[PDB]
């Protein structure tokens, strides 16, 4: 067999059936004779390719396979890889290299020092030393992406490798099963369970790896047994808990002092599936108040190492959440009471308050909708106003890198065809990966895109005011017609200048058979 | 003085007055109190920011300064940096970092291992160890970008650094003059001059560093004195010679065998300002035929080292071209005869042949127009059909990375306001950096964008046929309305479905007062 | 508190009480006011510093702390780090940096791009962005070294940092407990246990991470229950099993074909604590014969990913070995029969056969002796001839890098003062880290060094013969007087030219109160 045939057999045997790509000449010898049981999803720029694949991987809870063109294509995708690193997204990024005979002269399209290009944003990065090594290197890539802590990996392959003969002993790669589904040993787990049972006022903080593991329901049981309030760790990439469950307390503010103040009086704080903590704003103070002990369960040694406080356990989130939820005692304390609904912001017949938009989406969207957020000044309100009952219902750029949500919402929708995806994206954010719209049109992936148009980089204006920073350039983005951009890429387009039009547009979008973009005029 | 004030004084004293950027929160403490004598040029995605800056630097023949947001913004720009490396573009790429107090916990927006992120695509990459070092590190960045061989550099700065006190001894940085304007010592230069004078059938090959150095006129004199044909080195990023001068012989094919065949019978081949050689296609054979000696003058040790044949001299291209042009004898051989005009391709009243488009542009464009090429299947015809008399008249993505020409054409036009820029961009290529159009609209930078719409990745289809590669996915890009995209970003839009409409559209565009996009329907 | 006081409190609170070092000026502000409860162990070159620390860490089963001088000191230690990476040795390597005010000018002793220097041989490498971050970065270093898979880490600290004020909130670092003591979830563990119980002819292969985890006794129980032969994985850095236990079958040959042939007929092969596999010689063939299934338990995702065959489980070796040993059924098969003793090689009254040396050591050494091997041509015979009943009884350079055993034997002896350490080192190997002898003398660490003097790089001569490679230079090392070298560094020295003298010398050495070197004349 050839390296090409062996490699595609490895991919299929390891459950991969989709290639997210933007092709080039170094990749044509890989993409030729494309197997009939695989699907190719084209996107028009590599940030879009990787964003789509990322949303697909995150929602599918399985690795996604990518093929990019050499150094320039890889480079175009590196902002998307910054997010994928922070979300632990299991992405297998492949890129074609020049033919081995012309690497030394650095012919056009040579990826120089290729393995160093995507560092430090990948778990493993490699170029094989021979063609017959390619299947083995692909095996390594699959497993490195997929083992906890999951993350992106990179493999560069000289284009002449594919047609060469494979090692027949590569068959041993096909069915390898690699597990990291591990939990704390019984003796130490029993210590932890006793500390939880003995706590007088426990709190739980959950991060994105809970949702990645589909540990949400186990965390509900854990919270119910401990009678404990539940927060989402700051800068949240995913939603790990039902947002109208009585224990839910919302998104933590991303500040040192604010978090220690919130946790004051909680004697044991159990963090699961989050870094400790993804702070953002400068908010100096105490990491924890006297009287609070923190225990973190994390899938990532890097998280455990860098936590400034608390004990940690490095283990699989799914395995630990299940064990804890089934081992703790039922506390006799009263169950926490549900947070009240948010207030209705006064809304005239003009431009929409973001609060109005989120309330209307919550009113009209199906109960199993999936939301993406890249409306950076409105995150707090979004988290308060959307009832997200189910796992896999929320995504936000995990490194804060704009250009994620538009393509990722297409990947999520591809992963979950029965669940209506609604991406809420600011007018600034929408441009970074605007060309991703075309993939939704071409493959008829019926994502709804809600563009929050207030004409400015509103989160940055806000911050400039907290800095009392005057004369900052570049904060306004006037003059973008998002209906015209959607037309440009073949997506049905609507406008909402007031609440009546927003409801009419959403009704239309929800019943459409293809992707739809709604440009909403929001208060500046 | 603060680090902020000292740094902006350094920049101004070193001739920098423009910041190309997409802002973020780690950058607001740099961008605040933005000096009134500086200009900020906003673009909506970082590939666009860097492409614009690159075109500006290349055309202006001076460094361009960039400010990007942390890791995600830097990452979005890395495909643009792949091109900038290959063009030797002097780009000072800065990115904001988290406040030093929160780097260790890896707060959101921390650029982890920052200096490694843009490697291997930068000449120098650094994060200073203290705030007071920032001006000095900025000085290093300026000079590293600007010394031969020019290229991109990267500097990451924690946002809390700007307000700190600077070292008063940083004043010594302000007026430093750093020169690499060097040429071969007189004894060895005289040897080279004698070898050129003694050659019986010399040839000259010129690359992009000739145009970067504005050595074009000196190379004309050199060619005239030696009575030598002149070729452009393959995969050409720039045009180093008047294309209708009698010695001009065009773009070399990017193949090993093809180049040695072309040079057969030339006893001395003098290469100036190019790698030896930027081959592309697999075309195995002899690097040189018996009887040909090659001598390369290069500004880049990396080029000199990797050449598979020939002698080399590492020196400044401007200094060497001037010296050679003034020292060689006037040969008594006859001057080469000019190449004949290209043939007129038969054209009906339907979709446009690319040859027709280039002939019409050549007919109608001003004699000092500047062209950019990202119409990848039509490069050979473009090079044959445009009379480019002047330096700085052509740019093509130097690493082959799409997404260069659309933004770079805006930067070139900003650099050369009196010279009409015309970017000829395929429908596939146009999407990579489509949002760059907005910068042209907002700043009223009157670039003309000619979209060659044949609905496919035509260069890739072509190559798939040379491979006899069947079943390759992802090669078609139907369903893009470029007039709607231009409307989306505020740029005047025209369509050309036949030659009559192309001439009408070009007449309109050339007289417009702002940027214009023309969607041309080209033969598939 | 200062950064210095906070950092030493962190170290003590995390169990560190010893600094292995070679000092320099960038380190004096760290080493001043050296706490009275810490010990400093000086060695005369950094390969020796790190080797000593490595042996100490490996035998103590806890992290070892190192302080080296800037780039040059770090560099001198990088061959030692190659071994430490392969042995998963938990080493915290610190190096002093120039004062932050002079890093930018690259004053003498500046460690340029410091974190990249020890890559790729460290798990984590870092230089903090501020003085107050240093304790936190030290915390990260401790935990990164100590979490499975253990390994070396690197931290560079500007010398002016130590005297600065620490963050009072660094107290939260002091008592952090970080666990990776995890095992496969119960459902999947039960599947594995059933596969082991159902096997008709299981085999066990053990690697060094078994001995690191002190899982040896659990592996004995596992083997006894399964009635399974036990092999040591090839290129063994440690001894994971009693070598005269009836199930023991010795060191596997480090070849692909040889291993599959050895495992032929074994239906399930359980590998614990080893890479799959650390082959050495080129011995192409089948990774496994038909009928053999392989299951690997590894503490290292990198091992799991790169195995060319088999399933894998990534978990703590101690936790998995205990669980398996207590869960499998007692098989009714007969216990394997012990291997017979090795043959006595004929020995005249002249130069010693290595087999004679190992038999005599086995005869005379205490039953709880610890051996180190850097006698590269005699490894197979050593493994056959030493009865090593206890854990922690064998060390061999895990990357094959010479210069390990001499210093490591001093560290092992420091770690295990009641267990006589005997390092068996070839005459070639002895030179790499010869100066380590001085540390044994100065601290009166009573290691016995047995130099196997045959005047040649015997393993290389052997290989040159398997290659039929003629005219290979540099394979002989005549003219070294090891008794004089030992005198030079203050270590008692003996010679053994025949067996009578070897026994007399060993008797003397075993009763000595300090370190002793015995130069043995071995057959060439
Ligand atoms: C790739 C990238 N570039 C720049 C930024 C900086 N940035 C920018 C530019 C923001 C404004 C986003 O504006 P928007 O219109 O999408 O939303 P709001 O008006 O609600 O803030 S939020 C922010 O962090 C970023 N995070 N990622
Ligand atoms: C960033 C990037 N991605 C992918 C490619 C691969 N690629 C692609 C996708 C090409 C087709 C460009 O199509 P076009 O419509 O712009 O022009 P033609 O139809 O004339 O080829 S040419 C080529 O090298 C690339 N070079 N750069
Ligand atoms: C640091 C380093 N340098 C060089 C070698 C190469 N090498 C060398 C030089 C060997 C000969 C060791 O000779 P010896 O006298 O210690 O033992 P033998 O005579 O028993 O082989 S074994 C081997 O792999 C190495 N492994 N490590
Ligand atoms: Ca409602
Ligand atoms: Ca699905
Ligand atoms: Ca906005
Ligand atoms: Ca004409
Ligand atoms: Ca100008
Ligand atoms: Ca095209
Ligand atoms: Ca005996
Ligand atoms: Ca001890
Ligand atoms: Ca020897
Ligand atoms: Mg990189
Ligand atoms: Mg290194």
GROMACS .gro file of C-alpha atoms in nm, chain A residues 344-520:
model
  177
  344UNK     CA    1  -3.638   4.393   3.161
  345UNK     CA    2  -3.442   4.699   3.038
  346UNK     CA    3  -3.668   4.979   2.920
  347UNK     CA    4  -3.680   4.965   2.538
  348UNK     CA    5  -3.826   5.231   2.309
  349UNK     CA    6  -3.910   5.189   1.941
  350UNK     CA    7  -3.553   5.270   1.831
  351UNK     CA    8  -3.215   5.096   1.842
  352UNK     CA    9  -3.200   4.775   2.042
  353UNK     CA   10  -3.045   4.740   2.386
  354UNK     CA   11  -2.839   4.421   2.389
  355UNK     CA   12  -3.048   4.303   2.686
  356UNK     CA   13  -3.355   4.325   2.465
  357UNK     CA   14  -3.183   4.110   2.197
  358UNK     CA   15  -3.090   3.838   2.446
  359UNK     CA   16  -3.433   3.836   2.606
  360UNK     CA   17  -3.597   3.800   2.262
  361UNK     CA   18  -3.361   3.523   2.162
  362UNK     CA   19  -3.437   3.343   2.490
  363UNK     CA   20  -3.812   3.389   2.420
  364UNK     CA   21  -3.806   3.261   2.061
  365UNK     CA   22  -3.517   3.019   2.027
  366UNK     CA   23  -3.574   2.645   2.076
  367UNK     CA   24  -3.489   2.509   2.419
  368UNK     CA   25  -3.202   2.310   2.264
  369UNK     CA   26  -3.046   2.602   2.079
  370UNK     CA   27  -2.673   2.650   2.085
  371UNK     CA   28  -2.530   2.998   2.124
  372UNK     CA   29  -2.195   3.145   2.034
  373UNK     CA   30  -2.074   3.477   2.174
  374UNK     CA   31  -1.841   3.717   2.008
  375UNK     CA   32  -2.019   4.033   2.124
  376UNK     CA   33  -1.753   4.130   2.365
  377UNK     CA   34  -1.921   4.416   2.554
  378UNK     CA   35  -2.238   4.221   2.623
  379UNK     CA   36  -2.113   3.891   2.771
  380UNK     CA   37  -2.238   3.950   3.123
  381UNK     CA   38  -2.590   4.027   3.003
  382UNK     CA   39  -2.587   3.726   2.768
  383UNK     CA   40  -2.498   3.492   3.051
  384UNK     CA   41  -2.783   3.630   3.263
  385UNK     CA   42  -3.052   3.623   2.993
  386UNK     CA   43  -3.021   3.288   2.811
  387UNK     CA   44  -3.169   2.976   2.968
  388UNK     CA   45  -2.931   2.705   2.851
  389UNK     CA   46  -3.062   2.379   2.990
  390UNK     CA   47  -2.850   2.137   2.793
  391UNK     CA   48  -2.477   2.064   2.750
  392UNK     CA   49  -2.296   2.209   2.452
  393UNK     CA   50  -2.503   2.525   2.443
  394UNK     CA   51  -2.243   2.803   2.456
  395UNK     CA   52  -1.907   2.884   2.294
  396UNK     CA   53  -1.685   3.189   2.336
  397UNK     CA   54  -1.334   3.242   2.201
  398UNK     CA   55  -1.123   3.078   2.469
  399UNK     CA   56  -0.814   3.301   2.420
  400UNK     CA   57  -1.028   3.606   2.356
  401UNK     CA   58  -0.921   3.595   1.990
  402UNK     CA   59  -1.181   3.741   1.759
  403UNK     CA   60  -1.270   3.555   1.446
  404UNK     CA   61  -1.377   3.238   1.626
  405UNK     CA   62  -1.751   3.249   1.661
  406UNK     CA   63  -1.858   3.305   1.298
  407UNK     CA   64  -1.673   3.000   1.161
  408UNK     CA   65  -1.711   2.796   1.477
  409UNK     CA   66  -2.088   2.839   1.464
  410UNK     CA   67  -2.083   2.671   1.122
  411UNK     CA   68  -1.880   2.381   1.264
  412UNK     CA   69  -2.106   2.349   1.565
  413UNK     CA   70  -2.410   2.347   1.338
  414UNK     CA   71  -2.248   2.075   1.124
  415UNK     CA   72  -2.182   1.875   1.440
  416UNK     CA   73  -2.536   1.922   1.575
  417UNK     CA   74  -2.778   1.935   1.284
  418UNK     CA   75  -3.088   1.907   1.504
  419UNK     CA   76  -2.991   2.196   1.735
  420UNK     CA   77  -3.037   2.549   1.601
  421UNK     CA   78  -2.712   2.741   1.630
  422UNK     CA   79  -2.733   3.118   1.692
  423UNK     CA   80  -2.411   3.316   1.682
  424UNK     CA   81  -2.427   3.660   1.844
  425UNK     CA   82  -2.136   3.855   1.701
  426UNK     CA   83  -2.042   4.220   1.728
  427UNK     CA   84  -1.992   4.431   1.419
  428UNK     CA   85  -1.621   4.452   1.490
  429UNK     CA   86  -1.577   4.080   1.550
  430UNK     CA   87  -1.776   3.986   1.244
  431UNK     CA   88  -1.505   4.102   1.002
  432UNK     CA   89  -1.216   3.891   1.126
  433UNK     CA   90  -1.351   3.571   0.966
  434UNK     CA   91  -1.628   3.712   0.747
  435UNK     CA   92  -1.550   3.481   0.454
  436UNK     CA   93  -1.658   3.182   0.663
  437UNK     CA   94  -2.016   3.278   0.568
  438UNK     CA   95  -1.954   3.122   0.226
  439UNK     CA   96  -1.907   2.776   0.374
  440UNK     CA   97  -2.244   2.797   0.543
  441UNK     CA   98  -2.403   2.894   0.209
  442UNK     CA   99  -2.226   2.633   0.001
  443UNK     CA  100  -2.294   2.338   0.230
  444UNK     CA  101  -2.633   2.476   0.338
  445UNK     CA  102  -2.536   2.467   0.708
  446UNK     CA  103  -2.826   2.663   0.860
  447UNK     CA  104  -2.650   2.869   1.125
  448UNK     CA  105  -2.817   3.198   1.226
  449UNK     CA  106  -2.579   3.490   1.259
  450UNK     CA  107  -2.697   3.785   1.471
  451UNK     CA  108  -2.471   4.088   1.412
  452UNK     CA  109  -2.484   4.337   1.697
  453UNK     CA  110  -2.415   4.661   1.509
  454UNK     CA  111  -2.326   4.955   1.733
  455UNK     CA  112  -2.049   5.089   1.502
  456UNK     CA  113  -1.765   5.064   1.753
  457UNK     CA  114  -1.524   4.834   1.932
  458UNK     CA  115  -1.746   4.887   2.237
  459UNK     CA  116  -1.550   4.672   2.485
  460UNK     CA  117  -1.235   4.873   2.401
  461UNK     CA  118  -1.409   5.205   2.434
  462UNK     CA  119  -1.533   5.094   2.768
  463UNK     CA  120  -1.184   4.996   2.880
  464UNK     CA  121  -1.036   5.321   2.750
  465UNK     CA  122  -1.280   5.495   2.981
  466UNK     CA  123  -1.173   5.283   3.280
  467UNK     CA  124  -0.817   5.386   3.200
  468UNK     CA  125  -0.922   5.750   3.152
  469UNK     CA  126  -0.724   5.702   2.830
  470UNK     CA  127  -0.781   5.986   2.590
  471UNK     CA  128  -0.694   6.014   2.223
  472UNK     CA  129  -0.697   5.641   2.151
  473UNK     CA  130  -0.721   5.580   1.776
  474UNK     CA  131  -0.890   5.296   1.588
  475UNK     CA  132  -1.192   5.227   1.811
  476UNK     CA  133  -1.470   5.295   1.562
  477UNK     CA  134  -1.585   5.075   1.270
  478UNK     CA  135  -1.846   5.275   1.084
  479UNK     CA  136  -1.959   5.205   0.733
  480UNK     CA  137  -2.007   4.826   0.719
  481UNK     CA  138  -2.320   4.687   0.547
  482UNK     CA  139  -2.353   4.335   0.680
  483UNK     CA  140  -2.651   4.255   0.462
  484UNK     CA  141  -2.432   4.326   0.157
  485UNK     CA  142  -2.154   4.105   0.299
  486UNK     CA  143  -2.400   3.822   0.352
  487UNK     CA  144  -2.527   3.867  -0.005
  488UNK     CA  145  -2.167   3.860  -0.121
  489UNK     CA  146  -2.126   3.511   0.026
  490UNK     CA  147  -2.472   3.381  -0.065
  491UNK     CA  148  -2.637   3.395   0.279
  492UNK     CA  149  -2.992   3.525   0.325
  493UNK     CA  150  -2.981   3.864   0.497
  494UNK     CA  151  -3.227   4.054   0.720
  495UNK     CA  152  -3.213   4.381   0.910
  496UNK     CA  153  -3.358   4.460   1.257
  497UNK     CA  154  -3.364   4.833   1.333
  498UNK     CA  155  -3.615   4.802   1.623
  499UNK     CA  156  -3.778   4.531   1.833
  500UNK     CA  157  -4.071   4.471   1.595
  501UNK     CA  158  -3.823   4.403   1.312
  502UNK     CA  159  -3.603   4.187   1.537
  503UNK     CA  160  -3.896   3.961   1.619
  504UNK     CA  161  -4.004   3.946   1.253
  505UNK     CA  162  -3.645   3.871   1.144
  506UNK     CA  163  -3.594   3.602   1.404
  507UNK     CA  164  -3.925   3.439   1.309
  508UNK     CA  165  -3.814   3.434   0.950
  509UNK     CA  166  -3.465   3.308   1.036
  510UNK     CA  167  -3.584   3.030   1.260
  511UNK     CA  168  -3.805   2.893   0.984
  512UNK     CA  169  -3.550   2.930   0.706
  513UNK     CA  170  -3.396   2.636   0.542
  514UNK     CA  171  -3.047   2.778   0.510
  515UNK     CA  172  -2.814   3.008   0.695
  516UNK     CA  173  -2.939   3.357   0.777
  517UNK     CA  174  -2.765   3.675   0.887
  518UNK     CA  175  -2.963   3.940   1.082
  519UNK     CA  176  -2.799   4.282   1.118
  520UNK     CA  177  -2.931   4.433   1.440
   0.00000   0.00000   0.00000
